[PDB]
Structures are given as structure tokens and as C-alpha cells.
Symmetry: D2
């Protein structure tokens, strides 16, 4: 319970806390959700402060002693060593200034322990404002989440689906359109469709990266770069690209757009929301396929964790959450004013969560559900042999006219094509039973 | 780092964990969000397990010794003492069966420490299913949140807005329509409008309670009540009402509707979404009125936490955006039940209970640390009202609409009152006395306050 | 074509048009959607202008010959005779002032055809403003759509579901939880669930009416009532209630709230959104129960409404559940547009009214129409596959539980294993393991495996 | 009325109408919205039927005389002569079967007048299904709306915003963060931000075209191509690309994904929703800049439809944005709820995405031409406020100290004077700094970092 002195009086602070007065005031002002920044957001604030210190030292604006202490303190934060020194609520000042100052004060305290004295604002916040720092750390975290985590998780899910598409290439079954019996398909063809949806998901995430990776750093309070070196932005980005290996990080095309709006987060959420839509279709088909056994479709067996489809349920619930988060993101994105969008902490929480939920559930779905699915091959064939048939494959044998007559009589008397051919006395020199059965073969009808 | 034996192998459980093998499997199956049940949900699960034990004892189905240990353990859970014993992800099996089992296991381990042996399923889950318990806890938590926390928080914000509306009864200013100057209003009138929005919010929450407080308990696996006593639902609800004082808790009107759907959460979220919409309008007007101190509207000053950033309005508008997002996720889950069970309950419960908590906490902060301390630029607001082209219309009948337009244009260009412009243009005479001018340009009378 | 003169020049207007210069400007300014007001909004603007003329006449402000001509013209509009005289886009000035002036101009042109001169603004707009009128007409139209059309349509669907619940009271089947086999229910119990969802939907509409029915009329430009009589609102409301029988219409509790916000439309849309969520569950379950007929669940048969496919000549599709689910999607989209408009008012006026009004009134219309069609052309004609349903329930592992106290849970689980393996009934499997004798008669078995008693029907 | 028939039996039809039995059943089955297919959707169905008949002719599967009658009738449909012959509700069977059959029956009725007998299903629907035609028509209409209409409308809005950015390059004013006064910017810089948002919008639409332009045609009932030639898809797409000039049209990457899902409509709606979000920011800022003329910001004047104009075009833009956000939620809901071989939400998803394209196209051109192009800046006023703001005293701190900087800012606001004239009036010239140093430190245009 130490006490610190702030322009407006006394501030008691826990003794093991590396944060100082400004952070403690923010803890007292925003008791709203009881949840603070995630590890990914803390890491990104650490990376940004170390890179800013590096560029300020390289330009001779910051004494190398101070730069070295900030860089060492920043590397600790970026490595997860201080994820308990960020107690400010998500629902804070809309610039994220409070979390920016939290990072400054924690760095000042880490450096004081190694014998170096830093001013949180004058030293740790040199060449930065309260308004270009938090959106930069947000876009670093979002870009890392897309590139290093989500894309590889979706590729894992793609690869599991594609492996089933190949394994089940000739597992014939009935098609269903409008939930009603349709012509044959293979379980492989269905899984090739699921695989494409996740591949298109990766294409969607890749397509947003040119704008998701844009950083505001260098634009300072209003986007003009006042009180920062002219090249601060390009220099800081180059340090971040070198340290993270994230080639997608880049200076904003327009320094005003990069602070007045967070449109890059709205765009990216759209890709995540499309993936949630894709995953809902895949998960719903899979739990329906596994339904029953007696009262359902009983086409496949899901691995057990009468098995409940618990991972399709976790996938569909994650999809619901990404759709809600996406609505919250767009609402904050639309409501900027003049030189600043002041919904950054809320937008950051929601997009980083959507990235995390999709990454974690996709790897789980891939490994613990898709990879272990077993097909009820004999049951599926019996469903295919109960699908409607067509007369087209008899044309070359009985002619367009007779085929048309078979098709009409089958519909009138509610008989199969096969039985109708037999009942009309059509077996003979122009069509053996062998030919009939080859022409109407359900696997051939699936065109696999 | 202690070890337990499962039907499906072995599992290492932390030494100080009161959960057992089923919870630890759920921890291993669902590493998705890293976020578990909130305090309100955990409290509701404790309340429900206590009341179920009370009823099983009352009906002679459960030994009093075992009922007493469950009731004592469930009370500790309801009192918030075991919030770290629920590690299962929100994104679990859609019935919330995993969190149900988590409660049964924690109660058995609390009881063991006091010398009593409880089977988690056979004793703590007696008469209950994996499917009627979690939604009952959700509706308990949501009803308690609405009645005990959100309604009083909204009443505090209403009363703060109403107190400003009375203090500012005669604080005349320019109306604004389409953002353009318009005939006069008072700050008091505008704040009476904000107050009504918040009073209507309370009416909206009160109106959803007949369906939000419906509990599924007693419907067991599919709604039929198979393997429960016929009157289990009405008995457990009566214990819950006797213990909590929450008279809004009631057995569901239709036991199949209460498990096949969560329409009551969708309904309640719509009320919270309407409150978010209202708060967005109030917070946006307040940060605009405080804008400046030179190039903005500079109507009022917000208290610091007139160059103060509007941080509480920013907190309010961010919360409202979250409530809007949460509302979309709840409706999506709501729509997608199948046959006898809606399997989106954990996700729905997280979103509804968060929306209640954020709105409760931000409403009290907004009332106390923003509204209560606003200060109006009274003389400034009146001088702008008295200098507005919008107020020349009552001059038409004395000087004609052509000269009234000329007065408006000169007052604006010269930055003078309409009064001083009429005098300066030599219009005082038989067609218009100084007294008649002051009657026609009485901006407070134009506002028609009481 | 026929020329006119605005203050900003000369405007050409179609010959057959009762609108004038201001409406023709608004036609040229907002070529955005190609869609104008719906007949329900036009009707309400006519009801409102007639009530206003009647009150202005009663208070001695408007000459009786002018009041009578506005009243007669406004009755023609409210009766649907002039639905083609409102060409202005939905996406107009956010107060709806363009559509208000369209109404004033069309009433003046009707009065002129009978030899009476009305000034669109000073006569037809007397005691009104460009800001209290369009929201009043919107709330009249939404209240009418709720009370006269949606609630009776939902009652018709409730009554159809409830009749099925009663007809199928003894139609036993397996429950499904997580899409997996569960203990028995009846088709009647499931339909009683659907009925309750629609009855609750009616309760939700009724609960929003105290605020949906609030009218801004009398508040004029900013909510102060400047340039209107002090009691204009209570007088216009009294006439509207007497004429329409819509008892839910009332003057707003707070005149500022009623113009600064449209919270009553956001509230009502939430009720419509909840009905869309209920209808999605009901329609989804019904198409699943009708699925197949050979590769799906085949629990019920839906009445045939049209051919499904030319490739597959005899295939018939659940077209009404598809129409219901698509309507529900549109209602959830419209709901999001309404909340967005509702949040973004400023100071004395919300300027999203035309867009909010389009979305709320369309949600009312789609839910009313699709509910009636779903009740009459789908629910009413459903048939149950009773013998199929009972066969699965009598073969369910889930029904062995009541054998426990006779043969013990380990032997019950073996009966389940075997039944499910040998495709037998539980009853037959119990016989085929010789368990009938001392601790279990054949009558005692038939009593424990009574699947309808397991469903516990009232 | 006259009598017709289908597989289900006999139906009365308006004696006059060019549709037949299946269309009339659908008119009776679906009186829900009272709105039918839009011009763009009818056009797409006619283009597709003509292309299918051309390929069927080229593969010798359909007699030349029949293919010609279809191609001629389909040209009349695509050119917009027969729109009153499409009476079927949007809210129809979720495959759009009903509107497919409507196109087939109308084509057959047209060819009959010309004395040619076509079977709606056997000839006009040859090598086709319900399930592959309506989504193909939908993706043609959406691709055409993106490439030929929305991108050029956004480019016109970009150019108008960029022209303002250049004209207003030195129009210095107060920055605003949190709605509070901040260090200087120029109107030109703010408008360069708005231009970037719209340029980024065009980039978002272009990025979605590789999947928006994927066509289902050739997959028939379930995705397998049963009952069509193996290359029906590649041949029909080549005819569509040659007839429209839309090179973005392409065969589906996966024939099952292209019918089981409409994920390309969801993706495209995400781009449109983001544009709605950008236009909301741009329009809100412009109507605030024009607020007044006495009690608001009074930074600019919007053109009339001088100082007292209502911001009617910003109101239309923000109302259109609200509708695109609503439409977007409906499209995603439909997108998620496919089952097995078919998504049956196509007519509703098509209504919403094509409406969003249309609203954004039309409101963007109006905004550009009738609001942006005619804005006038209060140039001298904006500079005087910027020169009078407590925000610009900071560069004096090093000369006069924090305490005196604060006393200068306070007096400047109270006396409504410039910072320059408050520093002089306080007698601070001489000791602390010269007039040269004061004019260097308080140059508001240099502070905005503009030339
Ligand atoms: C946020 O609006 C203001 C903020 C501060 C001040 S002040 O106290 O500092 N005084 C002042 C006077 C002249 C120049 C600068 C400042 C005045 C204003 N408004 C105005 O000057 C309003 C105004 N009046 N008359 C005009 O013909 C006019 C023309 C264009 C734009 C606005 C107007
Ligand atoms: C929309 O803001 C304005 C609109 C019009 C005008 S004007 O051109 O018509 N001039 C004028 C001057 C005084 C009163 C009325 C008019 C000035 C203003 N702003 C201000 O007066 C800003 C301002 N400056 N200094 C203060 O100490 C102060 C105190 C409280 C609030 C604001 C301020």
C-alpha cells in the first residue's frame, strides 16, 4: 500500500505494482467490466515502446543509457513477464491513452530497479502522443493474430477436411436439397466443399492484410506528425518488422485516415465473420451427419470426448460470438469524429477475441473432431440406392422417346426408373439388366 | 498436483482445486477463450443446487445428512467463496452440462472436508438433468441482475438527469434540429427528455420480467419431468423465492418452450439494446455540449477525471456498442435450437449477463461522476439564444418578414443580439415600442417551460 | 407534363400528379432507392392531416370551408385512393419533411378540383411543423400494424399450432437433444412448445404498445409546442382514437423524448426480432420433421404447394418454412438498421425517421403475411407418421431405465445393447433374454415400457 | 383467365400474362412482401438463359431454330421489355426455383408469338437445374453492380474529396480529438483522410471480386454436373464474359461450395458494410462542419437543396449506411444456414446485397456532385480560431514557462483574442522572446505541417 503524489492529491498503490499514479486513477475511474488488456495487447504495447526507444536513440533525441533501459524493460513486457501490471478496464478513455500511460509507468518502474531514472511521458512517450500509440499496438496485435496464429490454424482445418475429401472420394450417399432426397453425391465431394470454404477463408484473411497491417505511429496527436521526427513512422515500422518477422506491418497510406478511423479493424472483422458463417454450415452438417443413432441420419461417427457433437456445438457458439463482436466493431468504427476514433479499446477487445476464438476452435475442431470421423459406408450406400434416379443415362439405349415414357410412368405410379424399365418389358437385346444397372449405378451418377 | 481415476483413464488435478475428473476433462476439451463463468452465473448454480437439495430432503428422496452438507456447500458457492473453482471455458457443450458437473464436483469436495460423502451425480444432481439446470441458473442470474442491480442503477441515473432538469428549468438556449439553429429550448427540457429515456428503459426491463424469470427446473432431459417428482419445479422455485426474495422467479408456462428455446434471454437483450440506444443519444449530446473550450459548442463543462476530455461519455458509448454486439450474438444463439434443446446456452448466458453488468456499472459511474457535476454556461447560452436569426419570426407582425430578415442578417454579421439590432436599425417607434420588442424576443417564454 | 414556379425557379410536373413544386424538387434530389412510402404510411399521413384540420376548425383557427375540404381530401388519402401520389424516396431529409409537404400539396390539389383554395403550409400544415408530423404518422402506422394486422395473424398461427398439439396429444416419439436420441415426448408436446413461443410473441407485442403508441403531435419544431395550441396533441389524439378505434394511441409522456428519439420503434423492433427467432426454431424443426422422405427423419408430411424440380420430377420441398426462415432473416437485418438509426439522433431531433419507418413497417408486414400463410398452407394440413414415430420410441435404448428396479441397471444396459444391435423393440429383447417370470410378469413389462406414460402427457 | 397444367395438375392464369402455371402457383403461394425481382436480377436471368441456349446449340444438344428463339426472347428480357412478366415475391422457395421457372415460361411464351414451340423445362432449362441458375444470375448481377456501377461511383466520390483536399491544402483550422480543441490541421488534410477511406473502399470491393464472380452454372441439382455436359460451366462463362465484358465472371473453384454456400455474397456485403462505416464518418463530420449558422461549428457551408441549409445529403448518406448495415446482418444470417448440397436463402440474400450495391452507388454520386463539389470554407474564420486556441501555446513553454503559458491561454479565451495578441498584451515580448521567435513558434500552418 504505497502512496504516490499526483497533481490532484494522494494515490495509494499496491506495493508489488510497477504501475504508478495515472494507472491507479484509471483503475478508480473505470470499474465497468473487471477485465483489462489481453496478453496479446500488452505484448504489442511492449514491442511498440522498445521500437520507439530504438528510433529515438538512433536519431540522438534519447540518451543511449535511457534507451537501453526502455528497450530492456519493453522486451520483458513483450515476453509476457508483466501481464499482471496492466489493471485498467477495457472500457476506458476511447483513445486508449490510459493503457498507453500504464505502459509508460510500468517501464519507468522496471528501469528504476536496474538503477536508471526515466520520465514516463518525456522519456518512454518521446515522439509519441496519447492517440497514435494504442491504435498502433492494436494493429500489431491484430496483424500477428492473423498471420502467426489464425492462418496456420485454418490451414490445419483445411488439411484435415481435404484429407477426408480424398479418403471418402467414392463413399456414395444421397444428396439432400431443401432437406429432401436428391441425386447421389459422395461424402468426399461434400468434404471438398467444406475444404474450399476454409481455403476461401484464408484468402479472405490474406486480402485484408494490406490495410490491417497499417500503423498510425508517427502521426502524433492529430495525424500531422507535430512533435515527432518526419521519418519516425517508417523507422519504427522497420524496427517492428525486424523484431517480429511480420512483413505485413506498414506505415499508414494516409496519416489522417489511420487515426480518424479504424476501418482496417472493420474490414478484418468482415473476413472473420465470413469464416464464422462458413464454420456454422460445416459444423451443422457434421452434427446432422452424426445425429441419432436411431432417430437421426447416422451417416458418420464423431469421436467421443451415443456421442454428443460437443465440438460442433463449441464451433457454432464461437461463430455466434464472432457475429456479435463484428456488430460491436462496426458500430465503434462508424462513430469517429474529426481527427480521432474514440472506440479503440472496445474495437480492440472484440477483434482480438474473434481472432483468438477462431484460431483455438479451428485447431480443436481439426484435431479432435474432423481427423477422427468414421463413415458408416454401408448405411450411406443404402441411402444413395434410395435417392431419385434419372432416365438420361438410358437415352443411348432406348431413345429419347421411350426414356420420356419411362420418366412419365415412373412419376405417375410412384415407381423407380429401374422397376419402370423392367415393368415396361424393356429388358432384351437393346438393354440387358447388366446395362440397366451400369447406366443407373449410384456412384457413376455422383460423377466422382 | 494430485491424481484422479476416470472411466476413460487418469487425470492430474491441481492440489487446491475442489473440482474433480469431469471438470478437468472439460478444461482439456475446451481451451478456446480462456474465460469461464462470471460470479453471477456461479452464484446462481450454488443457489439452484441448495434449493434442489432442500426439496429432495423435504420429499424424503435424499438423506438429511447429505442434504445439509449440499445446502452448506451450495451456500458458500452462492456467497462467492469459490469463484476460482470453475475453470471450464464459456465455449463448452451447448447445454452447459460441463459447468453443471463442475458445480456437483465442487459441492462433493467441500462436503468431503467436513466428513460427508456425496456422489456428484446421484446426490448433488438428484431429480435434475444435464439440460434443465444450466438454463435455470442462467435465468436466476439474469432475473437477479435485472431486479437487484440494473433497475436501481438506472433509477440512480434517472434521478441524476431529473435533478439537472430541475436545476436548469430556466437555462434558455438555442434548439438544434438537423444540427442547425432552431427556436429556443431550455437545458432543463433537454435533460427531462434524457430522464424520460431512462425511465422508459426501466419500464422496458420491468415488462420483460414475466418471461425472463421463467425457470426450466423440473423439466429434466426433454421437458417431460421424467425421473423428477411431478411438483419438483414448483417446490424448488418456491425455495428460491423464499431464500432470495426474487418474486419474479416462476416455473415456465410451457416446460418444452423453456428448454427448446431461450426466447426470454433474446427478449431481455432487446430491452438492454434499447437502453444502449438511449444512452448513446444522451452521452453523445453531453460530449457535444461540452465540446471546446473555443471551437466547439461550449454549452456546459464536464467535471475532470473546460478542457476535460469527455471520458465517461466515451465509456458509455463503448459499453453501448458492446451491448449491441452481445445482443446480435444472443439472438443468433436463440434462433438455432433444435427439437427438445437449445444448445447455445453458455454463449447466450455470457453475453446477457455481461450486458447487464456493463450497463449497471457504467450507469452509476455516469450518474455520479459526470451528470451530477455538469455546469452550464448560463449567461453565454442565453446571449446566443437572444442573438439567433431563428427568433426574428415574432417581429414579422410589427415590421414585416423582409425587415425581420434584414435584422437577422445584420445581428449575425455584427455578432449582436436581435434586440440591439432592432434598436440599432432605428425600428423603435409607434410600430414597435421597447416593451413590445422585449415581449416579442422573450426567449424563455418562446421555450414554454412551466 | 405541366410547368410550375418555385422560389428557386420553374419545375415540370407530370399531368396526372396531385403533388406540386416542393415534392417534384424532392423527386429530383433523392433518386437513391426508387422506392417511396408504403400504403400504411400514406394512410397514416391522411388520418393525421384530417385530425389536425378538425382540431384547428374546432379551435376557431381554420375556416370551416377549408377544414371540410382538408378532411374530405385526407379521407381519400387514408382510404388508399392516392397511393400513386407519393413519389419521394424513403432516403430523404431525415425528419420526413419532404413526405409531410407531399401530403400537404396532394391535399391542396384535391381541394382545388372542388373549387376550394388551400395553402399547403398555412392551411394544411396549420399548428404543425416539419418535425412532429412524420414521426406521429410513423407511430400511428406501426401501432395500427401491431394491433389490427400482426396480433390477429400471430393468433391465427398460435391457434393452428395449438390445434395440432391437441390432435397429436398421444403421438409418442423419441425426444432429440443435441440432435441425439433421448427419452420419449409426444409430437403434441413439441407443438404446445411452438404455440407457447407464438403466444409469448403476442405478449411481447402487447408489452411494447404503451410506448409504440406515443405520438409527438403538438410538440412542433423542437418539442416546446411553440406556434401550436397548448392542448393540440391531446385534441388530435382524441380525434384519432375516436376515428380509428386504436386505443393504444396517446400523447407522448415527454414531448422532447418523442422528437429527440425513436426509442419506441427500437423497442417494438426487438419484439419483432424475438418473434423472428421463435419462427426460425419452429420452421427449422418442421422442415427437419418433414425431411426425406427416404433419407431424412420422415416424422410428418407437409402439404404439397408446387413442383420442386424438373431433374427430380416428384420431389416436393418445404417452401413455406423456407419463406418463414427468409422473412425472419430480413426482420433481424431490418432490426439492426432500426437500432442504428435510433442511436444517432442529435439534440432536439432524430433524423433517421424515414429509414426507421421503412424497416419497422416492412417487418410488421412480412411477419403478418408469412404467419397467416404458414398457419393456413402448412401447419393446418400437416399429417403425422404415427406408426413410424412409435416404432422408433419402442426400440429406443433410452426407455430401458424403468426396468432398473426389476432386473437392475446392468441387465437393462444389456437389453439396450442387444435391442439396438438386433434391430428389435426393448419389449421383444427383454422376452428374448427370458427375463419374464418371478420379478416381472408380461403385464408388468408392458407397464414399465409404456412409452406414452414415459412422455407424461397431462 | 385461361387453363394451364404442371406435374401437380391444372391452374388458372391471367389470359393476357406471358408467364404460365408454375409462376401463377408461386404468385398464390408467396403474397408476403408485394415486391418482386429488380431490373438487374431480371437482366441477369435473361443473359444467363441466352448463354445456356448458345452453348446447348454449339454442343448440338439443342436444335438451331429453338436456340435462336431462346436467344432472341432472352435478349428482350435482358433489355428490360418484360419486367411486368416477373410477379413472384422475393420471399419464394429458397433456391429461387420459382423465378427460374418464371424466366423459362416467359421465354417460351415470347418464342410462341414468333411461331416457335419451346418446352420451358426441356428446351429453355436444358443442361440446367433450379439450384445452379438462380445463384449464377445473382452473382452476375452482383459482379456487374460492383464493377460497372459501384466502383465508378466511389471513384467519382474519391475524386471530389481529393479535389477539396487540394483546394483546401492551406485552410488551417483547429484539430479536434474527443470533440475537444487540439493542435492545428487543414481542411485539406481532413479531406485527404476522407479520400483515403473511399480509395480503401474501392480496394475492399476489388479484393472480393475473385470470389464474388464465381458462378455455379454447370453444377446442376447438387454440384455433381449430372444431366449437363462436363464443360457446360466453362462454355457458359466464356459466353457471359464475351457478352458483358465482365472478365471478373469465372467458373466456381469448387462446384459443391458454389451451391452449398453463398459465402461470396457474405464477403462482398462485408466490403459494402465497411464503405457504409466510412461514409458515416465522412457525412457526420461534414454536417457538423456546416452546423450553425450561430451556435454550431460554422466551419463550412453546404450547398442549398447560405449558412442555414439543412444537411439533407449527409442525412441521406447516413440513412443509406444504416440500411447497408441492416442488409448486411440479413445476408450473413442467410449465409450461415445452408444445409448439405444447397443454401436455400438465395432470393433474400440477393435482394439485400443488390439493394446495398444500388443505395451506395446512387448516394455516392449524389453526395459527390450535390454536396462535396459545392462546399465553401469559412477560411479567415477557421484561421482566426486556430490562432486563438489555448492548444497552440505549448511551443511558448520553453520561452515563457508553463505558468505564464497557462495565463496566456486563459486570457486569450476570456478576451476572445489571438494567442499572438495576448502574448503582446501581457508585455512578454523583449525578455522571453522577440516578435520573429513568436511568429515562428505560433505559425499555425507550419504547426499543421503543411506548405
Ligand atoms: C464555434 O464558433 C465560434 C467560436 C468562437 C468564437 S469567438 O468567441 O472567439 N469570437 C470570434 C469572432 C470572430 C472570429 C473568431 C472568433 C466565435 C464563434 N462563432 C462565430 O463567430 C459565429 C459567427 N457569427 N457571425 C458570422 O458572421 C460568422 C461567420 C462565419 C462563421 C461563424 C460566424
Ligand atoms: C458556438 O460558440 C460561439 C458561437 C457564437 C459566438 S459569437 O461570435 O456570437 N460571439 C459571442 C460572444 C459571446 C456570447 C455570444 C456570442 C461565440 C461562440 N463561442 C464562444 O464565445 C467561445 C468562448 N470564448 N470565450 C469564453 O470565455 C467563453 C465562455 C463560455 C463559452 C464560450 C466561450
Amino acid at each position: 500500500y504505497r502512496i504516490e503524489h499526483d497533481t490532484m492529491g494522494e494515490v495509494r498503490v499496491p506495493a508489488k505494482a510497477l504501475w504508478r499514479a495515472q494507472t491507479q486513477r484509471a483503475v478508480e475511474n473505470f470499474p465497468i467490466s473487471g477485465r483489462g488488456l489481453e496478453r496479446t495487447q500488452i505484448r504489442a504495447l511492449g514491442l511498440l515502446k522498445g521500437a520507439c526507444a530504438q528510433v529515438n536513440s538512433d536519431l540522438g533525441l534519447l540518451a543511449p543509457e535511457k534507451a537501453d533501459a526502455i528497450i530492456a524493460a519493453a522486451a520483458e513486457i513483450a515476453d509476457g513477464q508483466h501481464d499482471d501490471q496492466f489493471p485498467i478496464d477495457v472500457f476506458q478513455t476511447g483513445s486508449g491513452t490510459s493503457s498507453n500511460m500504464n505502459t509508460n509507468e510500468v517501464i519507468a518502474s522496471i528501469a528504476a530497479k536496474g538503477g536508471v531514472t526515466l520520465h514516463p511521458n518525456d522519456d518512454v512517450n518521446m515522439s509519441q502522443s496519447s492517440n497514435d500509440t494504442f491504435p498502433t499496438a492494436t494493429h500489431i496485435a491484430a496483424t500477428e493474430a492473423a498471420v502467426a496464429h489464425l492462418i496456420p490454424a485454418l490451414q490445419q482445418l483445411h488439411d484435415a477436411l481435404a484429407a477426408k475429401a480424398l479418403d471418402w472420394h467414392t463413399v456414395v450417399k444421397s444428396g439432400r436439397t431443401h432437406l429432401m432426397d436428391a441425386v447421389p453425391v459422395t461424402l468426399g465431394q461434400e468434404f471438398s466443399g467444406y475444404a474450399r470454404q476454409i481455403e476461401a477463408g484464408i484468402e479472405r484473411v490474406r486480402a485484408c492484410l494490406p490495410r490491417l497491417g497499417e500503423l498510425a505511429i508517427g502521426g502524433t496527436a492529430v495525424g500531422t506528425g507535430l512533435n515527432a521526427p518526419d521519418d519516425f513512422g517508417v523507422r519504427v515500422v522497420a524496427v517492428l518488422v525486424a523484431q517480429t518477422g511480420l512483413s505485413e506491418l506498414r506505415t499508414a497510406a494516409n496519416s489522417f485516415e489511420a487515426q480518424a478511423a479504424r476501418d482496417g479493424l472493420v474490414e478484418a472483422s468482415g473476413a472473420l465473420r465470413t469464416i464464422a458463417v462458413s464454420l456454422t454450415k460445416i459444423a451443422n452438417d457434421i452434427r446432422w451427419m452424426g445425429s441419432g443413432p436411431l432417430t437421426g441420419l447416422a451417416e458418420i461417427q464423431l469421436p467421443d470426448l451415443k456421442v454428443n457433437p460437443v465440438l460442433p456445438e463449441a464451433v457454432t457458439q464461437v461463430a455466434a460470438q464472432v457475429i456479435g463482436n463484428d456488430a460491436a466493431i462496426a458500430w465503434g468504427g462508424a462513430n469517429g469524429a474529426f481527427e480521432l476514433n474514440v472506440y479503440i479499446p472496445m474495437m480492440a477487445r472484440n477483434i482480438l477475441e474473434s481472432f483468438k476464438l477462431l484460431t483455438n476452435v479451428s485447431r480443436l475442431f481439426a484435431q479432435r473432431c474432423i481427423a477422427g470421423l468414421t463413415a458408416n459406408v454401408e448405411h450411406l450406400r443404402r441411402l444413395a440406392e434410395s435417392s431419385p434416379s434419372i432416365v438420361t443415362p438410358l437415352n443411348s439405349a432406348i431413345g429419347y422417346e421411350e426414356a420420356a415414357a419411362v420418366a412419365k410412368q415412373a412419376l405417375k405410379e410412384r415407381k423407380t426408373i429401374r422397376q419402370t424399365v423392367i415393368d415396361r418389358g424393356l429388358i432384351g437385346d437393346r438393354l440387358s439388366i447388366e446395362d440397366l444397372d451400369r447406366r443407373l449405378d449410384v456412384l457413376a451418377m455422383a460423377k466422382a
